[PDB]
Amino acid sequence: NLYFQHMKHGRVFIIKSYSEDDIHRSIKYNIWCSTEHGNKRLDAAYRSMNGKGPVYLLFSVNGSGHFCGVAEMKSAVDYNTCAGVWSQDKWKGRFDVRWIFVKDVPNSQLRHIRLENNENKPVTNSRDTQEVPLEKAKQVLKIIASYK
Numbered sequence: 001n002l003y004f005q006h007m008k009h010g011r012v013f014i015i016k017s018y019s020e021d022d023i024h025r026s027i028k029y030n031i032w033c034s035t036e037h038g039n040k041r042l043d044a045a046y047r048s049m050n051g052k053g054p055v056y057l058l059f060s061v062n063g064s065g066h067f068c069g070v071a072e073m074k075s076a077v078d079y080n081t082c083a084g085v086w087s088q089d090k091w092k093g094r095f096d097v098r099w100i101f102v103k104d105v106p107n108s109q110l111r112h113i114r115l116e117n118n119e120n121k122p123v124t125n126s127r128d129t130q131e132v133p134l135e136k137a138k139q140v141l142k143i144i145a146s147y148k
């Protein structure tokens with residue numbers, strides 16, 4: 001398949017969400033927020049990249065048994081922003097994103113991909129902002145990119 005070849009330099013992260021409504025707001029406005037340490041993690045991966053490659057985000061609603069799409073981080077993290085705009089006031093902050101695929105891909109299509117940096121646990125077992133090794137990430141993205 002013809003998706004995501006020549007990723008070159010890159011870093012990929014798992015996004016776990018407790019609110020579909022947050023996902024929809026994120027699609028509607030190309031913005032996201034994570035935890036305090038989630039924000040610090042993605043912030044570093046974004047600032048250290050210096051435009052030289054894409055920071056991609058893989059999205060899954062918790063308990064949903066699927067992934068729900070793919071997006072690219074498009075800015076650093078802003079820590080002083082309007083409170084209370086997400087489902088919980090515990091999401092303080094904002095960075096921009098750009099959604100690339102909005103589609104549901106069942107975990108049955110992805111669970112045989114494992115993260116050697118997560119004690120060999122499957123990709124579908126990740127917590128929020130679990131980083132993915134570039135070579136397994138490429139597998140995930142291509143699986144989602146082309147799922148029918």
Ligand SMILES: Oc1cnnc(S)n1
Nearest residue numbers: 017018022033086091
């Ligand atoms: O459940 C979550 C997780 N991360 N961000 C937001 S806005 N909601």
